[PDB]
Structure formats: structure tokens, C-alpha cells
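Replying to the earlier thread about multi-chain prediction with a worked example.

Input:
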Amino acid sequence: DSRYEHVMKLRQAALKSARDMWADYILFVDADNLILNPDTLSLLIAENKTVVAPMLDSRAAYSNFWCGMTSQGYYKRTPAY
Amino acid sequence: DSRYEHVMKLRQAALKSARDMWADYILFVDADNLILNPDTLSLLIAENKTVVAPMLDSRAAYSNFWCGMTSQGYYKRTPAY
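Result:
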């Protein structure tokens, strides 16, 4: 739980430091995500939505988007996955 | 002549700090000029021009815009003034 709290604090501090600098957009990347396509940022910018995330490939059914929360925030496979 | 090179320094050190803060626009008002209409910023913004200056009234013909520079940067009264 300490790890969760630390990550939460770090991300909220990043969000607050990206608001007092007068910036548009903020792109939360992490260590392992290989952003291969050079036009990822431009094609995400050019869609005009608030929160939007590219669908990153993987070797299994895993990816970085859900399609349903059961009751308390747990993954549930909708047929539209 | 040592006051021109100090007025210029102060402005150029503001246009420099209006760029290193990621800010649109910059309003150069000197604390002598009465800005009466409260909406003047909105009308100036909503015109979509690079350098635009409102016309301010005065007790005489003098205002805050020339209308013709002769050869050496001295005022010339063109008939359109």
C-alpha cells in the first residue's frame, strides 16, 4: 500500500507541476512502454478529446485498456474486447 | 541617452519572461494611461492580429499612433490622420 500511495503522490505532483507551467496536454509515459511510432504524439493531439490512450500491442491478450468493471473495479471481458 | 538603454532593457527582459513562461499575448500598459473600458482585453484578443494597439483619446490631436515616417523616423502628418 505504501507503493500505491507513493505512486499516487508522484503522479499528482507531476499533474500539479504541469498546471503551474501553463502547458497544454501531458503525456504520462513509463519505463517499459516502447512508443515506436514517431507520430504517436501528433496523432493523439489531432483527435480533440480530453483523455485518450493509444492501444499498445503485446504478446498475449493483454493491453492497456479495459472494457468493463464488475462491481468494485475489477476486469470483466465484454464481447467488444 | 542612458535612459533609452534602460527602458529598452526592462521591456526586452519582459518579452523574454513572457516567452519562458509559455504565455500567449502580452499587454504593455504604462502606468500613466487610463484603460477605461473593462472589456478592452477581450476586444483586442478577439481580433486575431499580431501587433494591435487601441486608439486612446487626448485633450489635443496627440494620440498613440503615427501614420507616416518621413525618412529618419520622425512624425509626418499625412492627410488620413
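The CA atoms of residues 42 and 48 of chain B lie 11 Å apart.

Feel free to reuse this layout for your own posts.
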